[PDB]
Structure formats: C-alpha cells, structure tokens
C-alpha cells in the first residue's frame, strides 16, 4: 500500500455558478459565488464587494439557487453537490461567529441512470413549493418543500421526453408549471406540464407544446406581469405564452451562441445575455397594459467569457467567468465612445483552465516558480505563480547608493514616524514623510557630511546620531545638540548599537558603554576587548524598561559570539562559531517569549541560539544558510508581533510560528537594507532599499501566492522552458473566421518576428496554431512561428537529442480536417532558436497525430495515434526510428523516470512501458486493466505511478511485488474533485519525499507528496478524529466526499490523506483540539501539521 499527501496550494478560482439575493439578512444584497468547492459569500456594498465568509463545501457545487419559503425572514440556499448531496443551507450570524447552519440535508442520487447530457439542472418553484432537479435522462426528480423534509425525500416523476435541453419553472401559475425544451427526431419542441405533489405525476400543460428553433437551447421564465417563457437560440429569440407568440431573429446574436442569461428588473422588463465570444447583450421587453409588445436585443459591449452573470445594482454586473477573469463591470447609461456601455470596474484574478504548466527556477534562486498557461480563446494568458511574503510595493523611488535607513519621530507629539533618515557613503540625508508626499528636510543637530551607523528616538524626548566620528545627542525640540560623546583619542567609531536608554560603541578593539540621561551622555564604563569587534547588539529583552543587561558581540580574529553582561562587561558566555568567516550582524530578539541570539556570518550562513536572558547561556545552536552576501538582521513589527528581516541577496523574513522559527523568502530580487516605516501616508510599511532604488510597501502578514499575468489573447496549449536560450515555448492557437483574418490582435499577431511554416510534405472558423517564443524576463513574445494551414500542434518539448550540443524546440503536430474523426497525417518538426531567429532543423512526416512527446535519454519518444515509437537523432540530423509499440488504444500521455516509460492510454489507463537497451525494443512490464479514462499521468517513485482520470479522481498504481505480476495494482484511491490537466515534478518552497504539482481546469494547483507509513497511520487517525469533530457545511460525510467515485464503481478513499482537512486542524479552537487529541499532546500534533503545511 502506497502512502501519499494531497494538499491544495491554490484554491480553485473558476466560477461555475453565482446567485444574488438576500442571504445574510433581509436588507442585505449578497452575491454568492460557487467556485468549484469554495462558496464565497459576499455583500454588495455601494462600492465593490465586502467578503463575509468562504466555506469549503465537501462537494463540487453543481446547482446553486436562492429561494425564500413562506415565513422565512431571509432567503435560504439550496446546494447540489455533483455527487448529488442536496442541502438547504441557512445563514445565521451570532455576533462575530458566522455559521452556515444546514436546515435539511440529504442524498438525491438514483442508483442507476444515465447522467444527463446537458448536465445537472436544478430549479426551484418561484412560489417555493418544490425544487425541480433533472439529474438523469428520462426522470425528473422533484423535491417537495411544503412538508418539512429534514432529509429531502425526493420522488421521481417520470418524463416521456428523453433528451431535455433546458427546463425552467413558469411564473404565475396556480400549479407549479415546468416549461422545457426537449429534442426528438423531428426537431426541438417546447412543452409544459403541471407538476402536482399530491398526485406525484405531471398533468396537461397550461399551454400546449409548440415547435422551436433547431437550436433553441435555453429558457427564461419571465416574471408575473408577462408570464410565459422566452426561448433563446442560435439565431432566434421566440417569446411564448400559449396564445401570444413574438419571435425575432436579430442579426448580431447569429455570430456566437448565447450561453448565459440573467434578469435585471424584478418585473423582467430587461434581460442580460452573454455569449461564448464574450459579448454582453441586453434583451428588452416592451409592455402594453399587461401584455408584451416587441423584443429588442442590444449589444451593451464586451466582457470576459461569461459563464454566469448577475445584476446587483446600479449597473454593477458581475461577469463570473470560468475561462477568464471574473470581472465586475458598470453599465453606463450612455456609450463609451466605442459603442460599449460596459466599463470594467474591478477584476478577480482567476487561474483559468490550466492547460499545462512548467516549474522553472527563474531568477536562478532556489525557489520554484510555476508558469501556467491559464485561460482560453480570448482570455488565454500566462500566470507566473511564486509564493511568498511579497512586497505590495506602494511607492518606489530612485536613489542609488543608499547605505542605511532609520525612521524618526521628528515631532515628539506625533505617534507615527514622520521622518526617514537615509545614510549614504560619507554623508547623510534626512527624508520627511508628510503624507504620501515625501520631501527631504534638514534635521538640525544631525551632521549631514558623515556616514551614520545609527540614529533614532531614545529616552527623554531626544534623538541620536552615531557618525563615524562622534556619538551625538539632539534635543528633539528645538532640534539642537545637547551632548557629543567622542572617542577620547579622536579615532573613528567602528561599530554602534543603541536602544531606548543605552549606547555601546566599539572603537576598534575598545568598547564604550554610554547610558543616555536627560541632556547628558554619561560614559558608565568601558573595556578593551581582545580582538577587533565585528558586530554587536544591545536590543532590550524580557520586561526591562529599555535597560538591556546583555550586550552580544562578535569578534574578528577568533571568530566567536559572546554575551557581555552590562555595565561591568563580564563575559557571561563565549561561543566559537567556527569557520574562516567573521560574524557581520548579530541580533538579540524575542519570539513568542522565546529568546534568541541570531548571529549571521559574513558568508550568508545564519545561526540562532536559544538565549537565556538571565544567565546568557546559548543553547540549541542551529545553523541555517539564507544566502551568500553578508546578512543584516533588522527587527520589525507586523500585526502585534516582532519578526526579523534578513537583508541579503535573498531577502528572508524570520518569524516564529508555534515556537519554531520559519525562514521565508521574500519575493524580491534584492534588499540591502530595511526599516519599519510606520508613516501617516504609509502606515505599517517597510522602506526596503536596494542598490538603485528605495521602495515602500507593507509586507504580507501571511505569505501568499503572487500571480503575474501576461495576456496573449489567444488560447495557449503547451509550454516548455529552454534554459540555454532563455525563453519559453508556448503553443498558442488563435481563431480565424474567413482567405482568413484574425478576429482580434493576438500575441501571435503582435510578435517581433514571425514566419509561416512552408512545408511541402502535404500536397465557419479555423484554428491557426503557432509556437510562440516568449522571453523569460520581459515576457514579450520574441518570435511567433505559424504552422501550416489546418495543422494542430499538440505537443512541445525542449531537449537536446543524440550527441549534438544544440537544444531544440520539438513540436509534434497533427493535420486536421472536418471530414475525418481521428487525424491521419502528422509531423514532428524540430525547431532551433538562435540569434532571435527560429529555424526549422528537421522534419519527419508520420502516419498519425503526435499527441505527447518526451525526451528519453537523449532519444525522442513520440506517440503517434495508438503507438509509441522511440525516434533517434541521427548524426545526419534527421529523426530515425528505433523501435515501435502498437498495443494501445490511444497513447496520449507519456512520462519517464530513468528508462521506464508510463503511457497514459485514453481508456486502458496505464502501461509501464520499459525500454530494454540491450535489445532495442519496448517491453510492457505491467498494465492496469481497469477502464479508467485518463486526463494526466505522472510517476512518483520506482513503483508509484500517479494517475488522474476524467471522473475527478486520483489513483496510484503500484507495481506488485507468474503472469499476475503484469498487473499494476491500484493501491491509492481518492476523489480529488477537479479535472487534473497536467502534472509536473517540483515545489514552491526551497518529511515528505517527492513533490508533484498539478494544475486543474478550475485553477486549483494541488501538490502530491509521499509519506512514511508512520506518519500515514498517524494522519489517518487524525483525519478520522477530525471528521468525528468538525461539522461540515452540508453535513456531507468526508469519507463519502473523498470516496473514489465513477458511474460504474465506488470505493472508499485509501492511501491518500486529505491535506486541507488536516490543515483545518490549525484553525480550530483549543478545546476542540483537545477533543481531537483525546488520545500524544496537542502541541506535538500542531507541530506535525505545521511541518506538513511547510511543503506548499
């Protein structure tokens, strides 16, 4: 039995359903958004949205609709998980606590039945007597509501029509009336029935059936004043009421099929409609006193590819998009000079359908940095995910040569820091923060013409400045000097570390410990340290009133960290750091009441010892390497806690999570210095400084994913990183209509250089594929190479083959024609990129489509339609066959480790194809004989082959241990809940052996890792206990939610640990933690789950 850990790095960001209504309370206006499993409730304030809750339903939310029964003060909510769990959620706020109480829950799955073609359609009676579901073809499951169903005891009502396109409840009928569009061999026919609960069977419809357009694909139940139902289609919008019939065929909507509708007015005088192309129409109903006069369709403008849109108020229409960004637009009453009444107000970042992604160590760090090809036809774009404590840079400044930053309360009355003190080589400049406006002032008392080692507010309403010549004390008002301690023999000061009431300066070998007193710097003591002092700090600790009884020092010759008691400079403890590299910045700080002495060597290595404040005994000597350049440890406060910022070439934050320090990268190229700048214009900021610029921006309270976006305006398909050329290879695929012309300026049409593939091998709207070359710094498409007419580039891999040194972009294409069903003619082009040019190095016509390709020990391993032939790169530079393999249905996915090959068949689901080099022929080591339709497949270890089938599941094939050894054993089973598009080894962080990121179609980026059996058993026990403790949103048993589910098979999840469920252990109060750990102590398990959380 294998053991694995599945955790969700990025929560899904595709909006498959969104409703509006008074859910939180009567006067509210909520905007619920049904991301794949997340249920992000919102409130529509006068501006934007105010998120109020985000509950993860244990289900793929397939139907969402708000209904208000009789007697309910606020709208309930009905949710139908795609596994057919139905729950009537109700919002209930109790002060701070927000709980989505489940009024009634139940399962509405029929044991046997064809899942309907169009998908689950769940509708509610407008008067709220029943909830009509159409799950399986032929049946129409009705849920009563007049009775109080605490289990949703639905009852099937048989349907005589087997292919129902869309069904809606009509408005203003004394009996609940459905009005659906079904297809029978004579065409499509609207029809109506009168549902009747007492009879549990339909009756004759209020207005008999009628013929509808050949592609009438939607229904819109207009409200009470008109009644009847509108029926949209490809080219017509027929309004029906039984005796009225007003049908129009507008010319604009012919271009692209309409897919989503919504009602603007409560009387349904105006309707919104969005189509696949992304347009946003507006259907207007004209009334007569009432009846309906005429229909008009107006093109409001353009938005994201609208899957589901709602009207909130004041033209604020939320265009929820599965493919693009979930926009939020304003409907101007008048044109925007472009004929578009729509102006995009906001935008919600959405990692759309992740077609494929590659992990790259861009910027040459130790940090993984995903690059996903999210999006679709018009919203195709590259997302660059890189987690961290990013810098929301508020204000960037050009100031080369900065060499130190400090904040100053230049006004004693003011609480926040109104002045920032830079310090350049051999001088000093003072910067005044007056709002976001920032001007340089002159602080009288601060010598401008010397470098500064420290300057800050101290006790008794006074500043201080420690130049390279003299410690200076400045009266904060009227800003003139009061005391100037100088080295008695007039030598330059080499080090200095001040605090609220103590100053210690190390001149060469000798120290001088000054105590600040009102308008008096009193040199209390001094000493002559043996070897030249390197760095030191006197940061206060414990609860002393700014009186630190310790002064940690680091010395040059005998590399060592010490702790000298003050004021006597008694050597309480000495510690030999070792090595040939001196300490450079030594810091004393507190972390959740656990003291530390972080000493950083000059080579980048960092030490942290557990300091005993009273006795100064360093224990728990630990070492961590954070960079290469010398480090500078500066403290700073974030959200009522003090962290440490390790300025280097790899700026690293140090904070203590649960009494264990965490060293987190900061998403910045470089940070030489820093200072916590809490200004009026930038409250609670960090004035990060580098070689050329000065930056300000609040640091992430908690680290998070940061998503750049490079729009292409054409759907990408595959991606590969060619390190030597420093560029990505992206297979865009734009749409052309007619010759042929582009419908919009895409990246392939906006490239610096382009070229059309002139190939002699082979001699509405079409797709004109390309192979973009994207610079990996500017993300500007360097070269856009267009493929032949009617050619689809399915595969792309960057590798160097054979023995030659050149690295090649290799694309496996496949000619497509409408007449055939499976492609016949393809080719494997071998491109080379050089000097801003993309040359065709080779070409190899094949006898089928080239689905997936993977370099195999320097030998290309294509996959023509149902065969896996291992080409060879001949010294003549033309691919030459070596050996084929034909025993497949269709080999779509290939992954390699060493010499083994894992082939993801279309439906036979695996084939551990192994290459015997001594013989030169493939040998099927094993296969799994289940009919698991694959989506993407990946290899973890020698005997762990992860696979992701199309029913939203995961499984792990384990090579077992006679002929039964040829059977791959499925040991792990887990209902992920997303359609996995791509796997790729890697991670996003610099306990769990292995790490396999994987995208999805909803934007989720999970992360699969292996586990030791001991932690597997421990975490499985934890998972069961948490299930017993935590209460889910819909009372959906977690064991059921993760049960490996397919239409023909259903098994409990095994060999997989739900990462999110374990991580929820962090966010449950202590008494329920004790419950969960009723039988090992709670803190130990908090530590364990933290070690798990570290991976993603």
């Amino acid at each position: 039995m294998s053991y694995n850990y599945v955790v969700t790095a990025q929560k899904p960001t595709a909006v498959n359903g969104c409703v509006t209504g008074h859910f939180t309370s009567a006067e509210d206006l909520n905007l619920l958004i049904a991301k794949n499993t997340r249920l992000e409730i919102y409130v529509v304030t006068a501006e934007g949205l105010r998120p109020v809750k985000e509950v993860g339903m244990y289900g793929k939310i397939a139907v969402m609709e708000l209904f208000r029964p009789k007697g309910e003060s606020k709208d309930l909510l009905f949710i139908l998980t795609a596994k057919y769990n139905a729950c009537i959620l109700e919002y209930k706020q109790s002060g701070e606590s927000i709980d989505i109480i489940t009024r009634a829950h139940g399962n509405v799955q029929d044991r046997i039945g064809r899942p309907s073609e169009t998908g689950i359609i769940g509708i509610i009676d407008p008067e709220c007597r029943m909830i009509g579901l159409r799950l399986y073809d032929g049946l129409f499951k009705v849920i009563p509501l007049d009775r109080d169903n605490k289990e949703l005891k639905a009852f099937n009502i048989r349907l005589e029509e087997l292919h129902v396109i869309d069904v809606k409840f009509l408005y203003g009928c004394q009996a609940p009336t459905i009005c659906f569009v079904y297809q029978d061999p004579q065409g499509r026919h609207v029809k109506t029935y009168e549902v009747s609960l007492r009879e549990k069977e339909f009756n004759k419809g209020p207005w008999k059936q009628e013929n509808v357009e050949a592609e009438a694909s939607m229904v819109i139940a207009v409200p009470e004043p008109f009644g009847g139902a509108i029926i949209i289609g490809q080219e017509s919008i027929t309004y029906h009421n039984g005796d009225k019939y007003l049908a129009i065929a507008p010319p604009i909507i012919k271009q692209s099929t309409i897919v989503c509708h919504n009602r603007v007015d409560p009387n349904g005088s105006r309707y919104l409609l969005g189509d696949m192309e992304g347009r946003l129409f507006m259907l207007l109903l004209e009334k007569e006193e009432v009846t309906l006069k005429d229909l008009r369709v107006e093109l409001l403008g353009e938005t994201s590819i609208a899957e589901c849109l709602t009207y909130l108020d004041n033209g604020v229409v939320f265009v929820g998009s599965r493919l693009g960004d979930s926009q939020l637009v304003k409907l101007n009453v008048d044109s925007n000079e472009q004929g578009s009444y729509v102006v995009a107000m906001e935008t919600f970042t959405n990692l759309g359908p992740i077609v494929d992604m590659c992990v790259v160590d861009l910027e040459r760090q130790g940090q993984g940095q995903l690059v996903t090809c999210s999006g679709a036809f018009k919203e195709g774009s590259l997302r660059i995910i890189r987690n961290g404590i990013g810098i929301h840079e508020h204000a960037s400044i050009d100031l080369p040569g900065i060499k130190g930053l400090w904040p100053l309360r230049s006004d004693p009355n003011r609480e926040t820091d109104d002045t920032l003190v830079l310090s350049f080589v051999g001088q000093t400049r003072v910067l005044m923060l007056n709002g976001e406006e920032v001007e340089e002032t002159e602080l009288m008392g601060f010598v401008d013409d010397q470098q500064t080692f420290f300057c800050g507010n101290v006790a008794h309403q006074q500043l201080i400045q420690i130049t390279s010549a003299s410690v200076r004390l400045v009266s904060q008002e009227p800003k003139a000097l009061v005391s100037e301690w100088k080295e008695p023999q007039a030598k330059n000061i080499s080090v200095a570390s001040c605090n609220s009431s103590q100053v210690v300066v190390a001149v060469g070998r000798a120290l001088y410990y000054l105590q600040i007193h009102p308008q008096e710097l009193r040199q209390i003591s001094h000493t002559e340290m043996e070897h030249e002092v390197a760095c030191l700090d006197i940061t206060p600790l414990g609860d002393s009133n700014g009186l630190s009884p310790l002064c940690a020092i680091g010395l040059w010759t005998d590399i060592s960290a010490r702790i000298l008691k003050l004021p006597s400079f008694e050597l309480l403890h000495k510690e030999m750091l070792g090595g040939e590299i001196i300490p450079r910045s030594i810091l004393m700080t507190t972390f959740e009441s656990s003291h530390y002495l972080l000493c950083a060597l000059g080579d980048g290595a960092l030490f942290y010892f557990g300091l005993n404040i009273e006795t100064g005994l360093l224990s728990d000597r630990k070492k961590v390497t954070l960079g290469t350049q010398p480090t500078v440890l500066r403290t700073f406060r974030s959200l009522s806690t003090t962290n440490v910022f390790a300025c280097s070439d790899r700026p690293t934050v140090i904070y203590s999570s649960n009494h264990k320090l965490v060293f987190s990268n900061v998403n910045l190229k470089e940070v030489n210095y820093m200072c916590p700048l809490n200004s009026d214009g930038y409250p609670d900021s960090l004035a990060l400084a580098n070689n050329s610029t000065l930056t300000i921006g609040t640091i992430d309270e908690i680290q998070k994913l940061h998503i750049r976006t490079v729009p292409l305006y054409e759907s990408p398909r595959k991606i590969c990183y060619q390190e030597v050329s420093q560029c990505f290879g992206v297979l865009s695929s734009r749409i052309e209509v007619q010759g042929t012309t582009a419908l919009r300026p895409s990246a392939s049409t906006q490239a610096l250089s382009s070229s059309v593939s002139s190939s002699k091998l082979f001699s509405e709207e079409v797709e004109v594929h390309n192979l973009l070359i994207i610079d990996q710094h500017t993300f500007e498409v360097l070269h856009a190479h267009q493929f032949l007419q009617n050619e689809y580039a399915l595969s792309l891999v960057s590798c160097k083959l054979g023995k030659d040194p050149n690295t090649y972009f290799i694309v496996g294409t496949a000619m497509v024609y409408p007449e055939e069903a499976e492609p016949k003619q393809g080719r494997i082009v071998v491109f080379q990129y050089s000097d801003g040019k993309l040359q065709t190095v080779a070409e190899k016509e094949v006898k089928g489509a080239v689905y997936s390709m993977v370099e195999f020990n320097g030998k290309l391993l294509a996959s023509i339609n149902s065969t896996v032939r291992l080409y060879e790169w001949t010294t003549e530079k033309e691919l030459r066959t070596e050996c084929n393999h034909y025993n497949n249905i269709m080999a779509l996915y290939l992954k390699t480790k060493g010499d083994f090959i894992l082939v993801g068949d279309l439906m036979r689901s695996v084939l551990l194809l192994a290459y015997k080099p001594m013989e030169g022929n493939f040998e099927e080591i094993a296969r799994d004989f289940n009919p698991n339709w694959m989506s993407a497949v990946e290899i973890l270890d020698d005997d762990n082959f992860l696979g992701a089938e199309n029913a939203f599941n995961l499984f792990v094939c384990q090579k077992d241990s006679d002929e039964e050894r040829q059977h791959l054993q499925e040991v792990g089973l887990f209902h992920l809940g997303e359609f996995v598009n791509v796997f790729c080894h890697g991670s996003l962080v610099m306990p769990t052996q292995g790490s396999v990121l994987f995208g999805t179609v909803n934007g989720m980026i999970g992360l699969v890792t292996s586990l030791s059996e001991s932690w597997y058993n421990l975490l499985l026990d934890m998972q069961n206990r948490l299930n017993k403790v935590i209460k889910s949103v819909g009372k959906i048993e977690h064991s059921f939610w993760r049960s490996f589910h397919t239409e023909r098979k259903t098994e409990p999840a095994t060999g997989f640990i739900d990462g999110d469920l374990i991580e929820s252990f962090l966010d449950i109060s202590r008494p329920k933690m004790q419950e969960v750990v009723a039988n090992a102590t709670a803190d130990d398990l908090i530590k364990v789950v933290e070690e798990l959380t570290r991976i993603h």
């Binding site: 046997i112 039945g113 899942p115 077609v355 398909r717 036979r908 039964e964 179609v1001 023909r1048």
Partner: protein, 365 residues
C-alpha cells in the same frame, strides 16, 4: 477527435461529453477481431454468456453440451494478439456437471465469488467460482429455459426461473424456498428478467405472446399486461393484450431501466414503456428470429445513444434503441447466434453461436 480533447482540456465540455461521444464512436466502428480469440471448448453450441458485472474480467458460457466454461478476457500476454484462455471449466468429468444444455449462466450479483446456472435437466445450481462446487441445487418439475437474478436487489436474492410450465418460479438463494410462484401466464415462459431499477419488478415473456411485469411483493397477479395497440383494440384480459403475434422469447430492460425491449418470433422488436406498458411505436424494421428458446440480447451502456445488439439469424444486428435505425450488421458466424453480451468497460462484444465459436467483436482503430 482532437476537438473533443481540447474542449475537455479547457473545461468547455464536461468530460462526460468526450467519454460518451468516444464510446459511441467505438461502438459504431465495431468489427470482428482477428487480433483476439476465445478458445474453443464447447462440444456443441454456446447458449449463454454473462461477463461479470464488477471489473468486467471473467466470462462464463453455457455450452449446449452441459459444459460451463469460465474465460478470462484480460490480455495477460505481451503481444498485440492473444487468446482469452479458459481459466476453469465444469467439464463432463465433473461430478455435478449439467447433464443437458446449459442455457443461462449468470454471476451472483454483488458477489463474483458465486455464479448460477440452469439446464434442461430441470435443475438450477449455485456454483462457487473458487472451488467450483454446487452450493445449492433446486430441482424443478419441468425444464428451465431461462432464469435471472436481480442485478440491483441488495435486500432479497430471489431468482425468477422460467420453466416450460405456465407458472413462473421464484427460487431463494438464501434459505431455500421455491414455494413462491407467480400465476397468470398460459404457456411456457421463455425469458424472464428483473428490473434493473426497481427491486421487485419482474418482467416475464412467454410463448403465448404476452409480456407481463410482476411486482413479486404483490401476491395477486401482475401489475401490467403489455398490449400492442396501447388499448386501441380494447378487450378484457382473457384472450387480449398480446405483446406479439407469435412466441415472445426475449426481454432486456434498457440500461436505465425505463424501457423493456421485447423480441418475439413474429420478427419484430418493440420498445415498451416499463412503467405502464405502452408501446412507444419505435419501428426497428423487421428483425429475423426463429429460435424456440430464450434468445439472449443486451443493450449498450455508457454511450451517447443507447444501442441494442440482437442476435439476427446468424448475424448480430445493431439498432439504436430510441430511434429504430439499423446501425450495421456484424457478420462473422457460421450458424444461428444464440447470445451476445456487451463488455461495457471497453465497448467489446462477445457473441456465442451454435457453431461452438465465441467471436469477440472489438472496435477498429
């Protein structure tokens, strides 16, 4: 088909769309395979086949000579071409072999460990897949054309057994009691079948041209008595409501369980509604059959449009259930075909004939 792959990839179409469209494409391209074989072991014809419900791996077959082979359809070899080797077999040397033709072999539902069979020796034996020993044997007073176990019932384990007497027998594989009988037919009962949807709805076809659905819980006759003209030629039920003009010798509920396909010796199929017994007037053309016992046939699962594979003389006919069109006519046999069974997992069809062969049809490309 790359269009479907891209559509699934970008989440446009549900994965269900590609799955069902590809299954339909494969079934439309169905053809005999010389890249696969099933070993010849039956002395006489093959009367029945039943791929196991779960995992679709093993496969029984009731030879007309009383031998119950138990194949293994998984290509355990390494070559593209292979033959489905017969794992076990209830040979004539077996002490408890069936003395005469075995005409129904069915796996015990929800449990592949056991399987059942019945023969003209007036016996129904409950076989243990592992040790191949009769767990229970029920001896009837008359032959047994066909029997069927509920593929959906987790509650009961009754076994409708259509003997050549006029009375349907219900045998209980739990504590033995064949006492329960369903009276109301007038002649032999050539084909019975439980409802895949409802636990207790049993549809029994007879040789007097009547198809009746029985609620076996009810002990006062049948719910419905199917009638060709939907009551147009209304006549009280004493000599009326005949679902065919000759013997009706085959039943097969559609996969959803919403419709009861019947084929009879008058050379017609009829897709009857399974809830009220109203013929839906699907034409199907003229289907040729002349067998004088249970004609087996099955209906595809997991395809866009449900197909039905009916033995048609010496050929398998592939009709579309809900439109009646004739997709094609699989043509590879040398005698009349007695039973074809659909392998839902991979859209493969195994059709035992009277010429001792079991031809495995598979899709092309």
């Amino acid at each position: 088909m790359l269009g479907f792959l891209s559509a699934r990839q970008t989440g446009l179409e549900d994965p269900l769309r590609l799955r069902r469209a590809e299954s339909t494409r494969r079934v439309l391209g169905l053809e005999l395979n010389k890249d696969r074989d099933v070993e010849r072991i039956h002395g006489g014809g093959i009367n029945t086949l039943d791929i196991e419900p779960v995992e679709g791996r093993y496969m029984l077959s009731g030879g007309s000579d009383g031998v119950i082979v138990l194949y293994d359809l998984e290509n355990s070899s390494r070559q593209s071409y292979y033959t489905c080797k017969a794992v076990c077999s209830i040979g004539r040397d077996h002490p408890d072999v069936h003395r005469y033709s075995v005409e129904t072999v069915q796996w015990y539902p929800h449990d592949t460990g056991m399987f059942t069979s019945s023969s003209f020796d007036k016996t129904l034996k409950v076989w243990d897949t592992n040790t191949l020993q009769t767990a229970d044997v029920f001896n009837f007073e008359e032959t047994v054309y066909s029997h069927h176990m509920s593929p959906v019932s987790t509650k009961h384990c009754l076994v409708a057994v259509g003997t050549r007497g006029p009375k349907v027998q219900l045998c209980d594989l739990k504590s033995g009691s064949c006492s329960h009988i369903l009276q109301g037919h007038r002649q032999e009962i050539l084909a019975v079948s439980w409802s895949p949807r409802y636990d207790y709805i049993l549809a029994t076809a007879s040789a007097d041209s009547r198809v009746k659905l029985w609620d076996v819980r009810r002990a006062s006759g049948c719910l419905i008595t199917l009638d060709q003209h939907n009551g147009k030629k209304s006549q009280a039920v004493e000599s009326a409501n005949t679902a065919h003009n000759g013997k009706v010798n085959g039943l097969c509920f559609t996969s959803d369980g919403l419709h009861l396909l019947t084929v009879g010796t008058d050379n017609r199929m009829r897709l009857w509604n399974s809830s009220n017994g109203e013929n839906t007037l699907v034409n199907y053309g003229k289907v040729c059959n002349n067998s004088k016992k249970g004609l087996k046939f099955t209906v595809s699962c997991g395809c866009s449009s449900e197909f039905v594979f009916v033995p048609y003389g010496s050929t398998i006919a592939v009709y579309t259930v809900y439109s009646g069109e004739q997709i094609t006519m699989l043509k590879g046999h040398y005698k009349t075909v007695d039973c074809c069974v659909f392998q839902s997992n991979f859209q493969e069809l195994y059709s035992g004939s009277r010429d001792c062969n079991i031809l495995a049809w598979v899709p092309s490309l």
